Amino acid sequence: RLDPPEAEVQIDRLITGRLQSLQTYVTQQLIRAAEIRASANLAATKMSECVLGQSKRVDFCGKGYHLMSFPQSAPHGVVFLHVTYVPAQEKNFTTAPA
Amino acid sequence: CTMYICGDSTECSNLLLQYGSFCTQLNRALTGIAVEQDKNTQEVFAQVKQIYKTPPIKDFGGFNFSQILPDPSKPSKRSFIEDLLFNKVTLALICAQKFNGLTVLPPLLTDEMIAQYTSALLAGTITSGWTFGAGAALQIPFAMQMAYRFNGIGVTQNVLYENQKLIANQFNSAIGKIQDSLSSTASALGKLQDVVNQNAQALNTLVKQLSSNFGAISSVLNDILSRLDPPEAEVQIDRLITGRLQSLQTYVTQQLIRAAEIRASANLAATKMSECVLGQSKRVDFCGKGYHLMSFPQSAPHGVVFLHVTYVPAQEKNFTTAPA
Amino acid sequence: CTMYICGDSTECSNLLLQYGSFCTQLNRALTGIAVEQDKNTQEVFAQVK
Amino acid sequence: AYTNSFTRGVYYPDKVFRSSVLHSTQDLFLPFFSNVTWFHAIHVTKRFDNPVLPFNDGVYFASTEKSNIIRGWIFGTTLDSKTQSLLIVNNATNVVIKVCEFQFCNDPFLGVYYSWMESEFRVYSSANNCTFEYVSQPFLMDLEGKQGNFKNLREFVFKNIDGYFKIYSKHTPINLVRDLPQGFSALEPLVDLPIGINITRFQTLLALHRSYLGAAAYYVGYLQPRTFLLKYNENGTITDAVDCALDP
Amino acid sequence: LSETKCTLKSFTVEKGIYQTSNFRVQPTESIVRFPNITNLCPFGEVFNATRFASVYAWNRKRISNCVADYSVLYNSASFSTFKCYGVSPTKLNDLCFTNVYADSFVIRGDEVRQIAPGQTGKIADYNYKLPDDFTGCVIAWNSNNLDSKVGGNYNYLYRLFRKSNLKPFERDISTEIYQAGSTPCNGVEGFNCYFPLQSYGFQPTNGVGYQPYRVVVLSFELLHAPATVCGPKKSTNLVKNKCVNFNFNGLTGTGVLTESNKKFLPFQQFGRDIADTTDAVRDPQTLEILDITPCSFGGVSVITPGTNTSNQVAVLYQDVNCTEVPVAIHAGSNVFQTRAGCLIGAEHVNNSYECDIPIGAGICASYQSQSIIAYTMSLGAENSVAYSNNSIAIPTNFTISVTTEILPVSMTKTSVD
Numbered sequence A: 001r002l003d004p005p006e007a008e009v010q011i012d013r014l015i016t017g018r019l020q021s022l023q024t025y026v027t028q029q030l031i032r033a034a035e036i037r038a039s040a041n042l043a044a045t046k047m048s049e050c051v052l053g054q055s056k057r058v059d060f061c062g063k064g065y066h067l068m069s070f071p072q073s074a075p076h077g078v079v080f081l082h083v084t085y086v087p088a089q090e091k092n093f094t095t096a097p098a
Numbered sequence B: 001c002t003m004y005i006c007g008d009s010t011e012c013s014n015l016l017l018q019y020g021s022f023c024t025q026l027n028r029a030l031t032g033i034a035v036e037q038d039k040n041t042q043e044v045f046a047q048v049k050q051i052y053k054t055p056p057i058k059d060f061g062g063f064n065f066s067q068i069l070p071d072p073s074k075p076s077k078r079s080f081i082e083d084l085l086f087n088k089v090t091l092a093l094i095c096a097q098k099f100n101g102l103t104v105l106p107p108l109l110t111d112e113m114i115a116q117y118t119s120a121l122l123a124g125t126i127t128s129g130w131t132f133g134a135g136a137a138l139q140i141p142f143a144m145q146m147a148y149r150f151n152g153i154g155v156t157q158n159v160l161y162e163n164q165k166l167i168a169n170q171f172n173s174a175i176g177k178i179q180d181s182l183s184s185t186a187s188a189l190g191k192l193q194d195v196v197n198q199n200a201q202a203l204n205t206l207v208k209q210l211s212s213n214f215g216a217i218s219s220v221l222n223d224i225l226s227r228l229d230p231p232e233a234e235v236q237i238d239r240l241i242t243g244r245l246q247s248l249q250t251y252v253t254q255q256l257i258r259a260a261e262i263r264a265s266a267n268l269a270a271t272k273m274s275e276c277v278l279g280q281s282k283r284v285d286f287c288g289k290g291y292h293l294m295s296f297p298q299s300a301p302h303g304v305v306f307l308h309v310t311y312v313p314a315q316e317k318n319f320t321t322a323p324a
Numbered sequence C: 001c002t003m004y005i006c007g008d009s010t011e012c013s014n015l016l017l018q019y020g021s022f023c024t025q026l027n028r029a030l031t032g033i034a035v036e037q038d039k040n041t042q043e044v045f046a047q048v049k
Numbered sequence D: 001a002y003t004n005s006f007t008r009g010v011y012y013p014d015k016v017f018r019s020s021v022l023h024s025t026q027d028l029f030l031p032f033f034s035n036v037t038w039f040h041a042i043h044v045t046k047r048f049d050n051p052v053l054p055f056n057d058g059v060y061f062a063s064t065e066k067s068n069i070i071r072g073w074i075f076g077t078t079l080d081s082k083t084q085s086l087l088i089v090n091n092a093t094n095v096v097i098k099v100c101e102f103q104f105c106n107d108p109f110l111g112v113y114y115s116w117m118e119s120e121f122r123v124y125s126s127a128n129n130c131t132f133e134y135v136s137q138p139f140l141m142d143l144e145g146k147q148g149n150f151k152n153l154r155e156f157v158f159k160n161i162d163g164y165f166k167i168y169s170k171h172t173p174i175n176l177v178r179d180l181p182q183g184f185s186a187l188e189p190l191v192d193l194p195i196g197i198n199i200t201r202f203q204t205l206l207a208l209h210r211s212y213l214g215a216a217a218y219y220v221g222y223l224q225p226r227t228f229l230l231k232y233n234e235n236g237t238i239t240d241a242v243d244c245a246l247d248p
Numbered sequence E: 001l002s003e004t005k006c007t008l009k010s011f012t013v014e015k016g017i018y019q020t021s022n023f024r025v026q027p028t029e030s031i032v033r034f035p036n037i038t039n040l041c042p043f044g045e046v047f048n049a050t051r052f053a054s055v056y057a058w059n060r061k062r063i064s065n066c067v068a069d070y071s072v073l074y075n076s077a078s079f080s081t082f083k084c085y086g087v088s089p090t091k092l093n094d095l096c097f098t099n100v101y102a103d104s105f106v107i108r109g110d111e112v113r114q115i116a117p118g119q120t121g122k123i124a125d126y127n128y129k130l131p132d133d134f135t136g137c138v139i140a141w142n143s144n145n146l147d148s149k150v151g152g153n154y155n156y157l158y159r160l161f162r163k164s165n166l167k168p169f170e171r172d173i174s175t176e177i178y179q180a181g182s183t184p185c186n187g188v189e190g191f192n193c194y195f196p197l198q199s200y201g202f203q204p205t206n207g208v209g210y211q212p213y214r215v216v217v218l219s220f221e222l223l224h225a226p227a228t229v230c231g232p233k234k235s236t237n238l239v240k241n242k243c244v245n246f247n248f249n250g251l252t253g254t255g256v257l258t259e260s261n262k263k264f265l266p267f268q269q270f271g272r273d274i275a276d277t278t279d280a281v282r283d284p285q286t287l288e289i290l291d292i293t294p295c296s297f298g299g300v301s302v303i304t305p306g307t308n309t310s311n312q313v314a315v316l317y318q319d320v321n322c323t324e325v326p327v328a329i330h331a332g333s334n335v336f337q338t339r340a341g342c343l344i345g346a347e348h349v350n351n352s353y354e355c356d357i358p359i360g361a362g363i364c365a366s367y368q369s370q371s372i373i374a375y376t377m378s379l380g381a382e383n384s385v386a387y388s389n390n391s392i393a394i395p396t397n398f399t400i401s402v403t404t405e406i407l408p409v410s411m412t413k414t415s416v417d
């Protein structure tokens, strides 16, 4: 319905509007892709100390005293199974230093 | 959005719809930063499943903990030292912000419940040891509890058993100086106040940026509508709308960027509360300078504070050695 | 800001003010990335008294 | 013959109320710590200073006196009978403003003889073909009868934009001997006249007491484009300012 | 409740708490206030009169203290040109104007296109010039019957030669020989020496492009200072404490009016705050100062157990005291005042449970004749150790346990064109 001289004026607004919604998407993706990296670094550190050895750090590879662990795979992630030692059935006595 | 961009105008409100739902996404982004803040504080303090009680009779061998234990006389039941950290950080018009659609929400956990969580860890760290971290608490006299930690760094038991009074006096005199150190200078908590200064100095720029023309006749919607017909006013109201819709996105982007730096600090505090306060650490320079013995937590506004106890040698001498 | 956007023009310099102080914030953001860089190298090497 | 003004010369740039806020503006202001000239009129060698001076973009005028010896000004381009000029006078009975084609004298002045009375008025010789006039209501003003140190100060600002003449003014009582005091004070709008002529010069006219060739002096300074920062009280007055380009 | 389904664009909602919108109040009536004045402006002395001036020496007249009703010109006057800059013709009946002026002169027929900013010609270069930021209107009409005669009319002149160009709203009424060459004129006309002023010759039989015209220019300023000329509108009384619309010398808005303590100067009429908004004004019929404040502020939230269970909800007001609540959409006697606002539609209780829906400030709500309740969240159990100086406890058995942990690793890849 309009000649080029009039169509350009109203096509520039559309172009500048549509070029703005393609940048928020990229910015948000860039921001949100920096947390999966932190999670994947923790997973890599946890696969070398609880699966390839025994850990003395408290509450790192489970609740209790660490014995061993096994890995498994899930879609877009990983799963761990931890084995621990837990006491029970305490009793009272009398004590002396020497 | 509508109360900040347009105001009470109905022509501006009707014209806004053409741009579409552009800030329901802004609100979606802003609402995800509050649940995270609520979850941050529940991984540092809520680590004990049971609320223990401080024993009434004090028989600890010569150690005095009376300055880091709850005081019933003081309201809110806060320890003496905790009350000095609450007078050194200050939370410094709000009516102008409220008239433009800006508000502040309260946290879920009150400051009185946070002090009930740090008074159970302290009570369970003195009567059981590290046995309450995994399982059920098992009692042990304190003097025999310190021998374990001495054996854990290489020294023997008779060294501790033969110098009890001196060690107790040293601990008392060392912990009696923190009070006077903190009762003089208020600049010690310099990093807990920067977060307050920010997030508060950045909410006034939003209000100040409402008095700028973006290529229009003026910056008041009641002076463009009092002299021009709708066909002409629609041309010059779009410039203001697009200008004011741009300063609401930089704020959200910067808040999103800067809220990802507190999560790392919260994770570090959560990791440091499970290894220095619920056990003994062999990692060098993790829970202080020297050889680690034990540690105690405390609470401050928007943060946490730790106190570390270490062992340091002195008075060396020279000898002669041989491999065999 | 003024040397990159306008140049030596005085008409552009006078017209810029209408948009307000929009890049003092840019400079505030840029100046906080240099103190951090200076502090980064002092926590790795300066560990011996 | 040379003095500097530290922080003097400031006028309200708009007509709107404001309180407890800092504001920034760009206008034609008199810079800080700038050179200024001194003109004398003292009879012990007698002196009588009324030279013709330029009018570049504006003018800041100040006079300290005990007995009224400064009356008005005359503005123009060639100060002859070939162009239009402007006249502001005080003939001791009322204020007169006229825009005609005058033929001014070489040494304009007024005078008194006795007690004291107004007798002589020698400014122009003829006026023709002019289209602006205004006369204020009559008043009686004292003459002479004083001697000692200076007591009064008066300041003025002149501008010429789009055929408009604007004047700001303010008066302050002071006690001093041989200088201009220091302080802060803002000037307020006075009047706006339509004339529509090209002005590139000006001059001052005085009075003499039945004498030839008592104590008074005046200053002169020009204007330049500048940007300032102003501060307001809780009441609504300006009390301090800063120049944004004086030094780093 | 129905304001959230539209917000999230669906017919089903789930458990949680949502924000919706703020609280709004609407105006009740209107109001107008204008200065009171009776005299009518001089519409006759200005437009149609005896004789007009020449272009090179025009005229200027001042108008003040009158009421502008231009409908009185419909009977006789017929204008062929009318243009206004900086304002809209349909809005001229509701405003008040300040510093008005009028100019008048006579020019030729096809030289009326040069009366406009940014133009070139012999009339816009030596006789009459207009500024760039103009505010006013231009009017012209044909006057061939009143300024022409047989033998011509030679009483209208215009300047033909000059050294430079004029400046806006400037005048020049000087006559002096003009030297167009290298020989000084010496005051006597001759070769390369001309008289700068010429004459217009008007005859009744000339073409349509050689006939006299009359021009008038109007100039004023708007909405910046006290005014003395106002249009044909009516006044009203003063209602103070309630949300109403107002018209103060052309300014429009809504809010609440109250008595203030500020003290304006003689040459001031409006006030401003940190942002460019108006919050003070002077009544033009009483000489007093008033204040203006908005009418809406305060947030809300909705608590629901899910649309698949029931249709009941509760509403939380975050800036009210339930003791005396003046703002409430509907406001069943189930009013409970927490530390985070005011709650309507929920039942208080005494015992404690584990939090289900976090309201805030140490309170929670859950759905449980079913209804909604609001308890206080509990911290946990309670215990007490037996600390003695010669006692100890030792285990005698053990247990084996297994637990799990989940961690995301990667993401999805994408591309755009």
Ligand SMILES: O=C(O)CCCCCC(=O)N1CCc2ccc([N+](=O)[O-])cc21
Pocket: E041, E042, E043, E046, E063, E068, E070, E073, E079, E082, E092, E097, E100, E102, E139, E218, E220, E229
């Ligand atoms: O062509 C028409 O249909 C009528 C146009 C005339 C519009 C006059 C007008 O808009 N104003 C605004 C303020 C004012 C003061 C004095 C006079 N005056 O000349 O008396 C006129 C006006």
Ligand SMILES: *[C@@H]1O[C@H](CO)[C@@H](O)[C@H](O)[C@H]1NC(C)=O
Pocket: D002, D035
């Ligand atoms: C400026 O003032 C100083 C101060 O006495 C004077 O020496 C100097 O001559 C003045 N400037 C000029 C151009 O004379």
Ligand SMILES: *[C@@H]1O[C@H](CO)[C@@H](O)[C@H](O)[C@H]1NC(C)=O
Pocket: E044, E048, E049, E076, E077
């Ligand atoms: C035109 O001028 C005559 C002169 O008296 C006057 O009678 C007449 O009313 C004027 N025109 C109008 C429309 O009033």
Ligand SMILES: *[C@@H]1O[C@H](CO)[C@@H](O)[C@H](O)[C@H]1NC(C)=O
Pocket: E035, E036, E284, E285, E286
């Ligand atoms: C008209 O305005 C004047 C100006 O203050 C005022 O004194 C007078 O009362 C007003 N007239 C009426 C009827 O109120």
Ligand SMILES: *[C@@H]1O[C@H](CO)[C@@H](O)[C@H](O)[C@H]1NC(C)=O
Pocket: E308, E309
């Ligand atoms: C919805 O309500 C129905 C009726 O009790 C129930 O059977 C169903 O499990 C609920 N949930 C869904 C997803 O339908």
Ligand SMILES: *[C@@H]1O[C@H](CO)[C@@H](O)[C@H](O)[C@H]1NC(C)=O
Pocket: E349, E350
């Ligand atoms: C719950 O507490 C209120 C307030 O003290 C009390 O009046 C009420 O009796 C309590 N409910 C029961 C069942 O005791």
